[PDB]
Amino acid sequence: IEDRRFQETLDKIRKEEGYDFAAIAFYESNKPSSPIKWHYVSGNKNNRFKLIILRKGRGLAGTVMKTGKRMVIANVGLALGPEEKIDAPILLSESLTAVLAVPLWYKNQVYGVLLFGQRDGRPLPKIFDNDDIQRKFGIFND
Ligand SMILES: [Cl-]
């Protein structure tokens, strides 16, 4: 899709799927040492996410960017240690208690990571299978 649609589609999907929060991360630049940052957000409580710097292979977005595998964390407090909590600062800046992170694809590469989150102990609305993934979030792929 055109770059000029990412925000609108992100917001609509967040609301359809019933999440408190959504975001999308990409590499900050084409420089070799580029970090990964959270480029778009929706349902965010503040702007501190703009300070977050993720090194390659680290946090939620780094791991999904690397592995090609979605991550489902039903409960942050139970599923993650404090070392993992630290690699994923969006958890802290947005007070997220559950999350779903999905890779977005371009010619078999992961070019971005799409994150959905809940606050206040609200559960994930549903755990999607591979086909629902593709159907609901395939708009972001080619
Ligand atoms: Cl993060």
Distance from the CA of 85 to the center of ligand 1, in angstroms? 9
* DSSP one-letter code for 120: T
Which tokens is 98 given? 């559950």
Longest distance between any two alpha carbons in the chain, whole Å: 39
Within a 10 A sphere around the Cβ of 60, how many other Cβ atoms? 27
Distance from the CA of 88 to the center of ligand 1, in angstroms? 4
Residue 88: domain span = 1-142
* Of residues 130, 138, 127, the one with CA closest to residue 104: 138
CATH number at residue 140: 3.30.450.40
Experimental method: X-ray
Distance from the CA of 111 to the center of ligand 1, in angstroms? 16
What amino acid occupies position 49? F
Q: How many CA atoms lie less than 13 Å away from 90 in the CB half-sphere? A: 32
Residue that has been written with the tokens 């899709």 in this structure:
1
* DSSP one-letter code for 124: P
Number of domains present in the structure of the chain: 1
Report the DSSP beta bridge partners of residue 105: 110
Give the integer Cα–Cα distance in Å for 138 and 80. 28
Distance from the CA of 127 to the center of ligand 1, in angstroms? 20
Strands (DSSP E) found in 54-122: 71-73, 96-106, 109-119
Handedness of CA 20, 54, 40, 45 (dihedral sign): positive
What amino acid occupies position 71? M
Which tokens is 23 given? 């975001």
